[PDB]
Amino acid sequence: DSVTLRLMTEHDLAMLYEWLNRSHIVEWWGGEEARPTLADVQEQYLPSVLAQESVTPYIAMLNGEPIGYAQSYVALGSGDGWWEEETDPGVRGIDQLLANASQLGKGLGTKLVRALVELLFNDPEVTKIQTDPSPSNLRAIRCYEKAGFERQGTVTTPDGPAVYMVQTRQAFERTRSDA
Numbered sequence: 586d587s588v589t590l591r592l593m594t595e596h597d598l599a600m601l602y603e604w605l606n607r608s609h610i611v612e613w614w615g616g617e618e619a620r621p622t623l624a625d626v627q628e629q630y631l632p633s634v635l636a637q638e639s640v641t642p643y644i645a646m647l648n649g650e651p652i653g654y655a656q657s658y659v660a661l662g663s664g665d666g667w668w669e670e671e672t673d674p675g676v677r678g679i680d681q682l683l684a685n686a687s688q689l690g691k692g693l694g695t696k697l698v699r700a701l702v703e704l705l706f707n708d709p710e711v712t713k714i715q716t717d718p719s720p721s722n723l724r725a726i727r728c729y730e731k732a733g734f735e736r737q738g739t740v741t742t743p744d745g746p747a748v749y750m751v752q753t754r755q756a757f758e759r760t761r762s763d764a
């Protein structure tokens with residue numbers, strides 16, 4: 586059915602910790618910080634701490650069950666080394682994961698990304714959404730393409746080379762109807 590988003594709260598942190606230590610997630614999420622301890626997740630993902638980095642955390646919901654984690658961020662407002670060429674404060678980036686190995690490759694990630702893109706463009710200040718999957722992460726790249734993102738090129742980030750992908754507000758508008 587329909588994938589929706591709610592703000593993550595401090596009450597979700599234990600659950601997020603469990604998720605971040607599942608093998609299908611560890612593979613693509615964490616980097617240096619792969620397999621975080623409970624304290625790590627509590628210290629790093631508390632919504633008020635993420636707020637200091639211009640990051641907003643969400644829980645993805647399907648049929649009343651939490652099925653994944655997502656975040657949006659102000660690109661111009663990111664940590665040292667991140668998006669240092671950005672000039673547009675309207676640019677938002679996203680990252681996300683599906684909690685359950687059993688639910689991968691069945692279109693749910695595309696639904697989640699579409700829901701996040703729609704949410705973000707419902708802020709009229711937002712001009713463009715970006716994402717930055719690893720070049721190794723072909724599944725994530727395809728999901729993003731299915732959700733309306735276009736590959737731009739390779740960029741150097743603090744987490745290594747990434748495939749920079751974008752979806753502009755104009756593109757989103759044009760694709761809302763076949764009219």
Ligand SMILES: CC(C)(COP(=O)(O)OP(=O)(O)OC[C@H]1O[C@@H](n2cnc3c(N)ncnc32)[C@H](O)[C@@H]1OP(=O)(O)O)[C@@H](O)C(=O)NCCC(=O)NCCS
Nearest residue numbers: 613682683689690691692693694695718723724725727728
């Ligand atoms: C990335 C993620 C959100 C994508 O969600 P998903 O529901 O698995 O993706 P979807 O099923 O919606 O779409 C994936 C597409 O990639 C293709 N694909 C699937 N596995 C693939 C693989 N191993 N290599 C290349 N392409 C693959 C699928 O065929 C599908 O395309 P198609 O519909 O044209 O056939 C999810 O797989 C996930 O959370 N993975 C672990 C964490 C992660 O990688 N997060 C993203 C970091 S940038």
Ligand SMILES: NC[C@H]1O[C@H](O[C@H]2[C@H](O[C@@H]3O[C@H](CO)[C@@H](O)[C@H]3O)[C@@H](O)[C@H](N)C[C@@H]2N)[C@H](N)[C@@H](O)[C@@H]1O
Nearest residue numbers: 613614615616638640658663667678680681717718
């Ligand atoms: N797309 C999946 C990736 O998402 C996260 O990395 C994002 C990164 O997120 C930081 O990491 C913590 C929450 O994940 C916060 O500190 C944010 O600053 C963000 O600051 C960058 N602007 C974009 C990065 N892509 C993960 N950190 C990373 O491990 C994972 O591979």
Ligand SMILES: [Ca+2]
Nearest residue numbers: 708709710711
């Ligand atoms: Ca406003």
Ligand SMILES: [Ca+2]
Nearest residue numbers: 759762763764
């Ligand atoms: Ca149209």
